[PDB]
Ligand binder design. Sequence first.
Ligand SMILES: CCCCCCCC/C=C/CCCCCCCC(=O)OC[C@H](COP(=O)(O)OC[C@@H](COP(=O)(O)OC[C@H](COC(C)=O)OC(=O)CCCCCCC/C=C/CCCCCCCC)OC(=O)CCCC1=C2C(C)=CC(C)=[N+]2[B-](F)(F)n2c(C)cc(C)c21)OC(=O)CCCCCCC/C=C/CCCCCCCC
Ligand SMILES: CCCCCCCC/C=C/CCCCCCCC(=O)OC[C@H](COP(=O)(O)OC[C@@H](COP(=O)(O)OC[C@H](COC(C)=O)OC(=O)CCCCCCC/C=C/CCCCCCCC)OC(=O)CCCC1=C2C(C)=CC(C)=[N+]2[B-](F)(F)n2c(C)cc(C)c21)OC(=O)CCCCCCC/C=C/CCCCCCCC
Ligand SMILES: CCCCCCCC/C=C/CCCCCCCC(=O)OC[C@H](COP(=O)(O)OC[C@@H](COP(=O)(O)OC[C@H](COC(C)=O)OC(=O)CCCCCCC/C=C/CCCCCCCC)OC(=O)CCCC1=C2C(C)=CC(C)=[N+]2[B-](F)(F)n2c(C)cc(C)c21)OC(=O)CCCCCCC/C=C/CCCCCCCC
Lengths: 369, 369, 369
Amino acid sequence: GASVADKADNAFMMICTALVLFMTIPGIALFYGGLIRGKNVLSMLTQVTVTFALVCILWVVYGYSLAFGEGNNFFGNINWLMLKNIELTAVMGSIYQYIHVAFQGSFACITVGLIVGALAERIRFSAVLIFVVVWLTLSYIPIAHMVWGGGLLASHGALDFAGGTVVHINAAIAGLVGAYLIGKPHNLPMVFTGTAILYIGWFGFNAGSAGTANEIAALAFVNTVVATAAAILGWIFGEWALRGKPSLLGACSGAIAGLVGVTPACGYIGVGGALIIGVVAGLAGLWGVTMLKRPCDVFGVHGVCGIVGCIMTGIFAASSLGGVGFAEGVTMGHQLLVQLESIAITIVWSGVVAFIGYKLADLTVGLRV
Amino acid sequence: GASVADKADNAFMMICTALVLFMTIPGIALFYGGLIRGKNVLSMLTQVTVTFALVCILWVVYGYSLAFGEGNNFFGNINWLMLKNIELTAVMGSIYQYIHVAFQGSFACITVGLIVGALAERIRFSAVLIFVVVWLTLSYIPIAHMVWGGGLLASHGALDFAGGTVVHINAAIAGLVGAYLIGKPHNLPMVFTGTAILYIGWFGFNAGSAGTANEIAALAFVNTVVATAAAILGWIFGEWALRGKPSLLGACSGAIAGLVGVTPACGYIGVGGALIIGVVAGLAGLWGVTMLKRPCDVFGVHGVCGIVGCIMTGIFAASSLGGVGFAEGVTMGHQLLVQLESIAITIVWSGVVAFIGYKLADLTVGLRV
Amino acid sequence: GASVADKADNAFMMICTALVLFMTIPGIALFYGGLIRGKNVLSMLTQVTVTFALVCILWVVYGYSLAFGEGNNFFGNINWLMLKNIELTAVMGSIYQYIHVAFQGSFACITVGLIVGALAERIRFSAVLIFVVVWLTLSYIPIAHMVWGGGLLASHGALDFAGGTVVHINAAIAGLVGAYLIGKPHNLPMVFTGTAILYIGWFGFNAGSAGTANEIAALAFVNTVVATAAAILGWIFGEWALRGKPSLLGACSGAIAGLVGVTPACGYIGVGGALIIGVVAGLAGLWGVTMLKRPCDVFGVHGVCGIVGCIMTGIFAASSLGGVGFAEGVTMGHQLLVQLESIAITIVWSGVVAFIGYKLADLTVGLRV
Ligand SMILES: CCCCCCCC/C=C/CCCCCCCC(=O)OC[C@H](COP(=O)(O)OC[C@@H](COP(=O)(O)OC[C@H](COC(C)=O)OC(=O)CCCCCCC/C=C/CCCCCCCC)OC(=O)CCCC1=C2C(C)=CC(C)=[N+]2[B-](F)(F)n2c(C)cc(C)c21)OC(=O)CCCCCCC/C=C/CCCCCCCC
Ligand SMILES: CCCCCCCC/C=C/CCCCCCCC(=O)OC[C@H](COP(=O)(O)OC[C@@H](COP(=O)(O)OC[C@H](COC(C)=O)OC(=O)CCCCCCC/C=C/CCCCCCCC)OC(=O)CCCC1=C2C(C)=CC(C)=[N+]2[B-](F)(F)n2c(C)cc(C)c21)OC(=O)CCCCCCC/C=C/CCCCCCCC
Ligand SMILES: CCCCCCCC/C=C/CCCCCCCC(=O)OC[C@H](COP(=O)(O)OC[C@@H](COP(=O)(O)OC[C@H](COC(C)=O)OC(=O)CCCCCCC/C=C/CCCCCCCC)OC(=O)CCCC1=C2C(C)=CC(C)=[N+]2[B-](F)(F)n2c(C)cc(C)c21)OC(=O)CCCCCCC/C=C/CCCCCCCC
C-alpha cells in the first residue's frame, strides 16, 4: 500500500553521492591548488573546506526544503526544515528521500566549491562566507527549484540533465562578477590529480542524475566517457595547431570542457551526439580562454561550454540525431527557445544575486584582503 | 529452502569495503605523511603498507573466525580458519558471508593503520610488527566480538554502530600507551588530501555498517555529512575565537572529530542529533588537543570524540530526540550506563593488551630505533 | 518476453567501471610519475591523458564491435560501429550492453596506460599515438576477442578471469619491445599514491569481471585482498633477506605483483590458493626485477607475474585445491596446456604487432625524441 524504495537504486545513488562529494573534497580543491600561487594554497583549502561545511548545514536546515519542497515557480516551502515531516522510509522516485537529500546536497557543495576555490585567493574569509549564504539561498536554491524542483523552467520542458544551468552557468556568472568587482601554475601534477578526481566523481554526478541504475544512467555514463575524450582531443589538437605544441594544462582544460558540455546533455543525447558535443565544447573552451585574454579564466570554460552544452542539448535530443526524443508535440525549434530561455534566466538571476551578495559583503566586512 | 543473498546489498557492501580500504590505502598514510617530519615519511609509508598486508592475512587465517565465530562472550572459535566450512554461497545477513569477511577485515586494517601511522616515526620496524600481531589478536578481535560478534557488550544492548569503541577508543588507547612508553607539519596539502580520502571512504565505513542499502544506511550517510560539517564549523569557530584565526589543520582536525564522534551514533540518531554531536565533538576535540599541550595528539581527538560519541549515542538514540529509539524496556538512564560500561571495558582491555604487546616487543627486539 | 537487466548488477558494474577508469586517471599516471625523472613528468602525464582519450574514442567507434561482435576466432565484426544496432535497453549478460561497452573500454584504457606511461619519457608524442592505434586495433582487440569475445582461446576453455593475458602479458611484451627498440625515483610518495589508487580501482577490475554482484564477485574481491597482502609480505621479506632492509618501492612493487598475479585467477581459485599465488608472484616479481638487472623493469613484473598467474590459475582452479573446479571432462594436465597455449599465443601476437606499430611509427615520424 505504501511506496517502496529500490535497494539497487539506493546503493547506486549513495555511491554516486560519495563520488560527487569527492569532486569537492578534495577534487576541486586540488584543481585550484595547483593553479593559484603557492602562498595562497593553504588559505584556499581552508575556505573551500569551511564553506563546504557551511553548505552542508544550510542545505539540511532549509536548503533542501526551499529547493525541492512545494512551492511556487521559484521557491519551495519550509515544511522540511531539518528534514522534519520526512519519514525515514519516505521514498523520492525509487530511492529513500534521505538519499535524495544528500545527493542534491552534494550538487550544491560542488557548485559553491567552483566559486570559492577560484577567488579565495582574492576575497576576505569573512566576505566569502557572507556571499555563500546569500548566493546559495537566493540563487542556487531557486534556480534548482526552477529546473529540478518543478519550477518555472521545468514546466516549460527545459532539458538540463545534470545541471548545465543549475551548476555550471550559475556558478560561472557568480564567479565572473566577483572577479570583476575585485579586478603561473604552482603545481601542474596537482592540477592533473584534481582534474582526475573531478572526472571520476563526475560519473556519480552525471549518471547519478538519472536517480536509478537504469539504461538512462548507462547512457549518461558512456556519454560522459565519450564527450570528455572527444573534448581532450579537440582541445589539444586545436592547441597543437595554434601554439604548435600540446600542454598538460590544455589536456586537463579540455577534459573539464567536455564534462561541463555534456553535463546537461548526457542523459538525453546519443553517443554520436556526445562526440560532437565533446569536440565542440573542447574547441569552444579553448576559444574562450584565449579570447578572454583580450583561475579567473576557468569561469570562461564553465560559462561557454555550459551555454554550448545547453544549446546542443536542444538539438541532439532529437530522435533523428540518436537522442531520446523531444516531449510529445515539441519541435527542435521550440526546444531550442526553451534552452535559450533557461540560459538567459539563469545568467540574469545569478548575476543580480551574486552582485547583491558581493556588495553586502563589501559594506559589512569589505571584499579586499 | 536455503538462504538467499541480496545482490543490491552485495554490490553496496563490496563498494563500501573498497571505500574502507581506501581509508587506509592511501588515506591514513597520506594523513600522517603530511604531519610527521619529511625524513620519516618513506619509512612510515612502508610500515603502514606492510602492517596492512599483515592484518589482511591474519584476518582470513584466524582473525575473522575468532571475531565473528561462536564463541563465548569474548572470543569466537577456530572453525573458520582460512574461511574453511564457509560455503561460497553462504549468506551473512542479506549478503554473501565472503563479503562480510572482507568488510570487517577492512575495519581491522584501518584500526591498525591509525596506530602504526602515528608512531612509525618512533618505533622499530620489527617492534611494530610484533605489537600488531599481539594487539590485533588479543584486543581488536575480542572487542569486536564483544560488540559485533554477539559477545558481552552486545548482549547488554550496547549501541555502537560503526565502532566508537571497537575502532576509535580501542586504537586511541593503544596509541596513547605506545606514545608514553617511548616518550612541524611537513605537508599540509598532503594532510588535507589524506583527510579528504578518509572522509569519502568513511561513508563506506559508516553507511556500510548497516549491512544493506536501506533507510538505516541512508540515515547513517546523511548523519555523516551533517556531523562532519558541524564539527568543522565547531572547531574553526572555536579556533577563530581562541587564537583569533582559522587554520587548515584545524579544519581538517574538525572533520576527523565529527567523523569519529558520529561513528557510533550515525545509524541510531536523527539529523538534529547529528548536528549536535558534530558541534560537541568538534569542540571537545579542539579542547582535547590544547589541554593535551599541558600525531601523538590525534589520539586525543580519537579518544575524546570517541568517548563523547559513544555517550551522546546513548542520549540521542531516544525517539523523543529524533533517534530510532531504545530497545523495548530500555530507558535513557539504563542505556547510558551500558555505554559507559562499553567505554570502560574497552579502555581497560586495550590498555592492558597494548602494554603487553609493547613490553613483549621491547624484550625481544626493543622499541627504540 | 524480452531480456531484462538486473539493476543491482547495473549499479555494481557502473561503479566498477569508474574504479577501472580510476586506475588510469590518475592511478597509473601518478605511479610512473614518481618513478621517472621530474623533467619528463609533465610530458608523460600529457601523453597518458591524450592516449587515454584516444582509446575511449577508438573503442566506441570500432573497438568494441571488433572485440565483442561476431565474428571469427580472432576478430568480431563492424555492425556495432558507434554502437549502432545496439538498443539502449539491450542486455549483455545481466546488465545493459552500454554498461558492458564502458566497462570493457576501461580495460582497454588501462592496458594502453601501462604501456604509454612507462615509455612516454623516451618516445616521441607523434610516435606513441601511431603505436597506440596500431597495437590497440591489431593486438588488444583480437586478443580480447580470443579470450573474452568467444574467440580461439575461449573455445579451448582458457581460464583468464580479469586479463592475465589480455591486459598484463599483452602490454608487458609491447612495452618490452619498445624499450628494446630505443635502448632515480623522483617522488616515492607519488609512487605510493599511484599504487594505492591502482589497488583500490583493481577491485572494480577483478570483481567487476564477474559481470554481476554475486558470490564469484565476492570470491574475486577477497582473493584480491589476500593475494595482494601475501605478495607484499612475500616481496619485502625476500627483500629483507636479500639486501637486509625493506623499502617503500619494494612494498609497492609487491602489491602490484600480487594484483597482476591474481588477475587471471581471482574468480577461479580459493582463498588458500590466492595466498599461495600472492607469495609466489611476490617472489617471482622480486626475482624478475633483479635478474633483469643482469619503469622499463615493471614490464618484468607485469610479464613474469602475469605468466605465473596464468599458469597457477590452471592449477588452483581444481576443486581439490579449493577452486571452483575445471570444466566437465577437463583434467589439470589438459588445463595447464591450454594456459600455456594462451600465454604463448599472446606473447607472439603482441610481439609481432608491437614491432609493426613501432616500426611504422619509426618510418613516418621517428621514435627518438
Ligand atoms: C533577441 C534579443 C533578446 C535575447 C535576450 C533575452 C533576455 C531575457 C529573456 C527572457 C525570456 C523569459 C521570459 C520570462 C519567463 C516567462 C514565463 C511566463 O510568463 O509563462 C507563463 C506561464 C505561467 O503563467 P504565470 O506568469 O501567471 O505564472 C508564472 C509567474 C507567477 O509565478 P508564481 O508561481 O505565482 O510566483 C509568485 C511570485 C511572483 O513571481 C515574480 C517573478 O514576480 O514569485 C516570487 O516569489 C518572486 C521571486 C522572489 C526572488 C527573491 C530574490 C531573488 C531575486 C532575483 C532577481 C532576478 C531578476 C529577474 C529575473 C528574470 C525572470 C524573468 O512567474 C513569472 O514571473 C513569469 C514571468 C512574467 C513575465 C511575462 C508574462 C506573464 C508574459 C510575458 C511575455 N512575460 B515576459 F515579458 F516574457 N517577462 C519578462 C521578459 C520578465 C518577466 C518577469 C516577464 O508559465 C508557466 O508556468 C508554464 C506554463 C506554460 C506552458 C509552457 C510554454 C512556455 C514556453 C515558453 C518559451 C519562451 C521562449 C523565450 C525565448 C527567449 C530567447 C532568449
Ligand atoms: C564511578 C566510579 C567507577 C567508574 C569506573 C568503572 C571501572 C570499570 C567498570 C566496569 C563495569 C563492567 C562490569 C564487567 C562486566 C559485567 C558483565 C556481567 O557480569 O553480567 C553477567 C551476565 C552473564 O553472566 P556471567 O558473568 O556468568 O557470564 C559472563 C562471564 C563469563 O563469560 P564466558 O562466556 O563464560 O567466558 C569464559 C571465560 C572466562 O571469562 C572471564 C573474563 O574470566 O572467558 C575468557 O576466555 C576470558 C578472556 C581471555 C582474555 C585473553 C587475553 C586478553 C586479556 C585482556 C585483559 C583485560 C583486563 C580485564 C578487563 C575487564 C573486564 C571486566 O564473563 C565475565 O567475566 C563477566 C564479568 C564478571 C564480574 C562480575 C559479575 C559476574 C557480577 C559483577 C557485579 N561483576 B563485576 F564486579 F562488575 N566485575 C568486574 C568489575 C570485573 C569482572 C571480571 C566482573 O552478562 C551477560 O552476558 C548478559 C546478560 C545480562 C542482561 C543484560 C543486563 C546487563 C547490564 C549491565 C549494565 C552494567 C552497568 C555498569 C556501569 C559502569 C559505569 C562505569
Ligand atoms: C616445448 C617447445 C614449444 C613451446 C613453445 C610453443 C610456441 C607456440 C605454440 C603454439 C601452440 C598453439 C597452436 C595454435 C592454435 C591452434 C588452434 C587449432 O588449430 O584448433 C583447431 C580448432 C578449430 O579448427 P580450425 O583450425 O579450422 O579453426 C581455427 C582456425 C581458423 O580460424 P577462422 O575463424 O576461420 O579465421 C579465419 C582467418 C584465418 O585464420 C588464420 C590465423 O589464418 O582468421 C584471420 O582473420 C587471421 C588473423 C588476422 C590478423 C591481422 C593482423 C594481426 C597479426 C598478428 C600476427 C600473429 C602471428 C602468429 C600468431 C600465432 C597463432 C597460432 O584458426 C587457426 O589459424 C588455428 C591454428 C592453425 C594451426 C594448426 C592446426 C589447424 C592444427 C595444428 C596442430 N596447428 B598448429 F601446428 F598448432 N599451428 C601453429 C603452431 C600455428 C598455426 C597458425 C597453427 O580450434 C577451435 O576453434 C576450438 C575447437 C577445439 C576444441 C578444444 C580443444 C583444443 C585444445 C588445444 C590445446 C593445445 C595445447 C598446446 C600446448 C602449447 C604449449 C606451449
